[PDB]
Write a protein that binds this ligand. Structure first.
Ligand code: NI
Length: 341
């Protein structure tokens, strides 16, 4: 049974609701992005209309095999009519293909569903500037003031400088970056660019990257591991055992590994500056955890919401405990009293 926060009142629409069977009354199923918790339930046997971005549609067709006739891609920043209701898709600043959805209801109510997003001041000059939002369905992943992390640009600066230093000192070092989903591609692309290398990976991952409309991608990535000194591996292999095992396979080409684990927030954020981050080291293997987030910090979220001034907020993350729900409602009321809406 579909929960309330995935239904859009006054429409036949649902958002990120594929794991509940046939939802009674649903005429169109929206998918905000290609992350497994959100697409859970879609497969090649699905026979209802799916609305999404072009990139998300490339992934549904090639990776999940959903048939073409049920894929409905929409351009961004463009007023579209779906089943008699005006909608707009906006870039969510999450992973490739991720959108927010603006619904203009036939009674005059305007609803924004953020999907998963990393709020940014640039969103204050999208099509959202133009009009009022009555209801906001909000990605509250990091809705508590302890959740702090740096900008994506600072994190990439640390990674590029760390990798370039290590490989310049030791031309025989290999760099490895962990992945388990789409998103965070800038980590491995920026490191490979400073090193003058293509990124090497499995056939399955190459396939996924080829769906993403990244400019000049054929110049940046490869399945030929031997030619590359930046390799991608599944996130589960980013540990001393997994990496030892990988270096064996490289046939005495390398004598050292430097690896990166992009995480979201971790408690070491509450003490340590990005500058001060140190690795875990065993022998000729070092592993850096780096806090590259594709979700809003507390401060970025609060800024966005205070600027938008919605009349009602419905959280979509951390909704399963009474303490979480109560905590989030308190911050929404502070924000409203502080800003005066
Ligand atoms: Ni996501």
């Amino acid at each position: 049974t579909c929960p309330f926060y995935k239904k859009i009142p006054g429409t036949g629409f649902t958002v990120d609701a594929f794991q509940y069977g046939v939802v009674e009354g649903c005429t169109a199923y929206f998918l905000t992005h290609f992350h497994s918790d959100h697409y859970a339930g879609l497969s090649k046997h699905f026979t209802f209309p799916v609305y999404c971005s072009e990139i998300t549609g490339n992934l549904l067709k090639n990776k999940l095999h959903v048939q073409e006739q049920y894929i409905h891609p929409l351009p961004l920043d463009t007023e579209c009519i779906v089943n008699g209701v005006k909608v707009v898709l906006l870039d969510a600043n999450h992973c490739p293909g991720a959108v927010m959805i603006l619904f203009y209801l036939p009674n005059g109510t305007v609803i924004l569903h953020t999907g998963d997003f990393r709020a940014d001041p640039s969103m204050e000059r999208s099509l959202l500037a133009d009009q009022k939002v009555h209801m906001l369905y909000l990605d509250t992943t990091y809705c508590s003031p302890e959740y702090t992390f740096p900008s994506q640009q600072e994190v990439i600066r640390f990674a590029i400088n760390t990798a370039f230093e290590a490989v310049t000192l030791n031309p025989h070092a290999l760099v490895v970056c962990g992945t388990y989903s789409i998103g965070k591609e800038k980590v491995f692309l920026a490191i490979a660019d400073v090193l003058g290398s293509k990124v090497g990976m499995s056939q399955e991952k190459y396939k996924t990257l080829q769906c993403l409309n990244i400019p000049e991608i054929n110049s940046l990535i490869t399945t030929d591991m031997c030619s590359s000194l930046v390799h991608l591996l599944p996130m589960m292999q980013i540990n001393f055992k997994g990496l030892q095992s990988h270096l064996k396979k490289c046939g005495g080409k390398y004598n050292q590994i430097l690896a990166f684990r992009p995480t979201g927030w971790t408690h070491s954020n509450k003490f340590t500056r990005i500058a001060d981050v140190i690795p875990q080291t065993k022998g000729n293997i070092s592993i850096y955890g780096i806090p590259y987030s594709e979700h809003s910090s507390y401060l970025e979220m609060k800024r966005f919401v205070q600027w938008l001034k919605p009349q009602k907020i419905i959280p979509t993350v951390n909704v399963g405990t009474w303490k979480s729900r109560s905590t989030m409602e308190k911050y929404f009321r502070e924000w409203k009293l502080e800003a005066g809406y």
